[PDB]
Subunit: 434 residues, 4 copies
């Protein structure tokens, strides 16, 4: 069971197109040191672009040389001098990840692109804003769509910051101390197209902060998307009926088709901890490992392989739900109430030159009046409001306009059409410098 | 119990000097909007620099206005129009944290400063390098000291990156939608000395990514320091006896003083998960919270308050152990062995124009020879090595020099004096651009 | 900072009434071995029932002997022979916990008692049952109240199982190997009223599984209560309006009192991860500690001290919400719909001797018929249903009774009045054997 | 991607032999209700023991009926009336797990059996006991072997306790409320050989405490085995050289075979968090799921499938390392020192009628004397000790016997041969009542 425990091939199959490319460079490195002749350098170089399985192999690194060694045979044995598994593999992984995050950053970018573009489009819809899940203030639909953009926007700032910490080159760090044969790291950083070489042989080998940061990230992006899905499956309630799901991104409901059953917005929510799970593990796996490269570290692979395949895929379903998303407008506009407008009478007298406690006591007196009058806030008489405060005049009429209350929240970052337009710029622009 | 559950004062006492400063600005904001008169603006402004307890208060925000309201009384009621608890508090927290990370980044900087400076100083000491905890290669002491620098160096890059994400200004985001009275956010970002204002009212209110990133960070810095301490308490073993602890940073050992008992390097290791614990929680606490500002979020405080007080303090003990640290040199130099030098005979013939498998088979033949000769590698005759390979000549003598083997690992990032010197520059410089 | 890091008194104040009691026994132990004379045994025994602070002390164990040593002075020095801090403290903790779990098991018992009793009382209320948060089947209110009982019932089985694993006596395990002076463990297990003594000196000292299990438990009970609160704050939605919160267990809502704002059912949900946090830590804190009693372990205290004070308190607020809980019955009964009854026409023909696919295709044909007839399921004509299937007869009338559909789910464990009554017995009884 | 997200077959292949068996019973259930005729009951019964793949299927439940439906065709459609996926699957999982824990409890039992038996065998070996990783007291080797038994013994008490909570029968709980057709649960609990039926339809469906407890368990057993491996890889240090690994359970070391390189005892340590990871996730995945059976819950499978395959396998390698384990006795006996015996002179005068502080001050005076005499504790003259205390006499000679000091720790649970023999009984017996 042990060797079938040491066995890395099942999960690490993916490093093929990375194992050959990382070698072709180190091939070019040794010859520059004069360890290989052009003629033989060009021998194992082609093989690694001339390159079934076998039971005796442990890892993908094996699978290759074990193959390389037939077609070439001679040169093959030497190809791998000075560069051990431990430095070979981190090169084999920084490389895959750095390609996979380029991908990851693009998918996430479309999600933010898809939301911001839609926000512009649905800008004028009204619906309610909740606090402790209870109707509090009329606020715009794009203002909701936008808070999931801005927050998803941060994730790509993060993932762009990690993109650069992954781009380091460790190759040539040997096993504990560096490369004995002297081969220059610089050539290895140019060919592999990485940002720069690493300034220490024991860290490049024993450290996996690059995967740790990536899992911190993922677990945070999901915390973000599991909230987007908590909001949506709640807005998708027969009770609420704000948004209706696409019958392609929705589960089969029969004999009672009124039950437009979610699922996509549930699978997105489950992953929150399945992604966090691996991070919660990868950090404990290395809680206090003594020295340079312990075997413990074989966990780096399976983990970034699962969390990245969950992420690249989920983000696509998330964009796939926001764009299809069909909203029931009337339902949303009928979801408002003058009870939320009560706080707005306080803001009126404030502009007419009155203090707040007082201003909001008049609102309180306006509530109690309709209560006992029985007929609500819209049903209140002008002279009546002139009783509560003479400051009250003809312009109280406009305070009963839900969209007026919304265009009352200005000053950059508010929910006025003006401010939503400003946000739709800032995110798009933020993305433009990404 | 509930209100004594709602009660925030016990832990949130610290926000005093932050609650008064965040107000003095918002005081200057409202008047600019014309909500306060200079004369009254200057009334509540002084009070908030003119400013015992009381049982009826819930939070530190209360404690202040409840105090402000006597001395001023009049103006006091209005002071707090438009800015609710939810936007008041995140301002009250971004602010504290941003001062505490300035602090945090300085402490961590000295730790890296203290190690790099020492590395330069002890550069020439030799000791062994372990793999799966077993003697593998002679490598320098500063080369160990340096791998904990480079790695701690990354943490300050992170913490500097968070330092900027915390520096955002949310004030003026009202409750769900923005500020109704229009007060300009810009003035609020200038006075509070923050980088810029936030581009959304619902995110500034419901989001705590700023504390989430900080806990991700801390848990990673400890993973780093709990390893430094795993290495040190192991090097501090009577069995190993590489380093001897300061009897100030070491625990009382009696009747057998030979037992120089560690503790500081144990308290540093325990925290790994006590720091990770809060992060593991803070992310679950908000696994999928429906909408804008739920009460759930009251967890943001106690958590960054504990993790930051653990971090600022531990880092000082860590610098406090590295600088005092007294090493038993002889013990370390006697900790080497020609068995580790066996792999170096393979690298000799390689330079004399021989292939590796062959070169390392000759080493293998050299091992077996001393084995059966009984007398080890240093005890091997020249013509004997001329038997294993005629390439072997007078210069085999120098291969038995531990420091020669170490100066064999060059090419940037290795453990040669040359490379350690290069690293001592790069970190110091990295820090110079921080 | 270090000693003010070693300092245990701030959090470990609570062990007073446990430190004196654990000693009085070990006093009785040593004399039985003949290490103390009755006369002097009775000297330090009284002191420890005759027993301000001081800065030079580290722990609560200190605080006591340092006090004991004045009043007695002589005998005092010897009192503590053979029993070191490491075995003294685990005794000091098994003891506190075992009293605190007795407490914990009682609070949780009342919560289950309070729910089951209420279930009996509100048995006949109808409301809907949701799947992916969408109206699916009419089911009883006590059937909801009962699923949180049964599940909370398991937690007390767990906590009762841990109650016994905590009840082990470690005292007398010295430091690494046992007690050198021979004092019998048996007497120490009788006096301290524990279940039995521990069969190993190195485990009793280094192991904290007793707190680890307790935190596993807590984190699971909250997962349970954070769900009860997710259900309730959702049922408390102005949109849903199933249950209305007590204005004592509810937060202040003004100018729009229609917004009966939750909080208690939010504080209960936040803790989910604040409780899980400590568990997520306590397990990482000891991920692979080498040998017998490392200092790392000082984490055992602060953690079970926070998680237990959160638990004993939350459970009271949870019982405090279920009992006050006021429900809007009409709202709940009007929350049903014949669309959910469609699946019940399939179960009718099934009893009249028809196969399901067919039976449920007739229901499907009945849906489409009302759809196109425009007039819903209750509005369907008898001969009409005799068209879809002649099996349909006069008894179709009763299928439109929501409570008939509910009394259709029998066979132990269903939601028929009969089954709810059966459950109200089983839980109560389960508790009776606890 | 969504459906290839909904797809369960890849991981859930294993439930075959469980899906057919759970049906054959429910087949026998419906007929007893009179829903199936013996003749047709015996039709789908054989098929489900008469029972390639297909792309249109989602789960293993599908794969079967989709197959069942050809060979039988007729009866097949009805086979699945009243029992939906949600209750079908938990039956499909309680069942697999309950078989897999029987297995799990046996493997773990052999590990405890293998250690206890060996302890008896190596009983007389001496080696040192460490505290903060520093030589403190001479203690027996079986006394180490035994502390990992007692602690592993608890895990099987746990796993035996979960074994019973898994043994519950949910089948017949329909979807939200129970079985509509009335089929008796009792028959379903007898045929499936489970302990009893569940007393609630909404809990059996939405709850996964059974997997949650199993992951709590696993993560704890590994915390235990990752410590056993931390101890062993440290005892396996060339520096320590207490135990030598089997060259079958050890990694290839060349050119320096003195480096007997561990691995098995590293793979065991890595899993600590890979096991904890899933638990840390599975609990967050359900942090506060609203109602009866949300789709979120599809996580129950992949998780208990990975954690159980890691556990059943690791435990075998752990038994596989303890039994092969070859110890270097001389090395261990030479690992002792009279410095550890210093504390034993204090225990001598104590028996000769002297108080401790005094007794241990004489030891202190004995240390200082040898220090300044230069010649250590064994080199101390009788009249010399008669100078420090006249109580000192001829029997001081035996205090310099390491095994005497070990046989000084009696009173049940100590490290005297007498006590180790007592422990070897208690564990074996504990296992006998398991």
């Amino acid at each position: 069971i042990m060797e079938k425990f040491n066995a890395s091939i099942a999960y690490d199959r993916h490093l093929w197109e990375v194992d050959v490319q990382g070698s072709k460079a180190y091939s070019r490195g040794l010859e520059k040191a004069g360890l290989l002749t052009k003629a033989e350098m060009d021998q194992i170089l082609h093989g690694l672009d001339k390159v079934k399985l076998n039971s005796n192999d442990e890892d993908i690194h094996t699978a290759n040389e074990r193959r390389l060694k037939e077609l070439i045979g001679a040169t093959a044995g030497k190809l791998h001098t000075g560069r051990s598994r431990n430095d070979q593999v981190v090169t084999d992984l920084r490389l895959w990840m750095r390609q996979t995050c380029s991908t990851l950053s693009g998918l996430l970018w479309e999600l933010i692109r898809t939301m911001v573009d839609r926000a512009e489009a649905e800008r004028d819809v009204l619906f309610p804003g909740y606090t402790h899940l209870q109707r509090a203030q009329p606020i715009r639909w794009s203002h909701w769509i936008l808070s999931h953009a801005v927050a998803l926007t941060r994730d790509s700032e993060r993932l762009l910051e990690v993109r650069k910490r992954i781009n380091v080159l460790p190759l040539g760090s040997g096993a504990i101390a560096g490369n004995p044969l002297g081969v220059d790291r610089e050539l290895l950083r140019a060919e592999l197209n990485f940002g720069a070489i690493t300034l220490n042989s024991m860290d490049a080998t024993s450290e996996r902060d690059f995967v740790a940061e990536f899992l911190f990230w993922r677990s945070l992006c999901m915390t973000h998307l599991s909230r987007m899905a908590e909001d949506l499956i709640l807005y998708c309630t027969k009770e609420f009926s704000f948004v209706q799901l696409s019958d392609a991104y929705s589960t089969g409901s029969s004999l009672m088709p009124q039950k437009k059953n979610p699922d996509s917005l549930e699978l997105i929510r489950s992953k929150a901890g399945r992604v966090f799970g691996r991070c919660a593990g990868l950090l404990m796996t290395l809680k206090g490992l003594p020295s340079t490269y312990n075997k413990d570290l074989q966990e780096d692979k399976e983990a970034v392989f699962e969390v990245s395949d969950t992420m690249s895929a989920v983000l696509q379903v998330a964009t796939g739900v926001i764009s299809t998303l069909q909203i029931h407008q009337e339902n949303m506009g009928q979801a408002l109430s003058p009870d939320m407008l009560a706080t707005d009478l306080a803001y009126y007298l404030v502009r007419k030159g009155m203090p707040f406690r007082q201003a909001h006591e008049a609102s309180g007196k306006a509530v109690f009046m309709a209560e006992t009058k029985g007929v609500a806030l819209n049903q209140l008489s002008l002279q009546e409001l002139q009783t509560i405060s003479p400051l009250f005049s003809g312009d109280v009429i406009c305070v009963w306009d839900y969209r007026h209350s919304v265009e009352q929240y200005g000053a950059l970052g508010g929910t006025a059409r003006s401010s939503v337009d400003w946000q739709i710029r800032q995110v798009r622009a933020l993305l433009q410098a990404q």
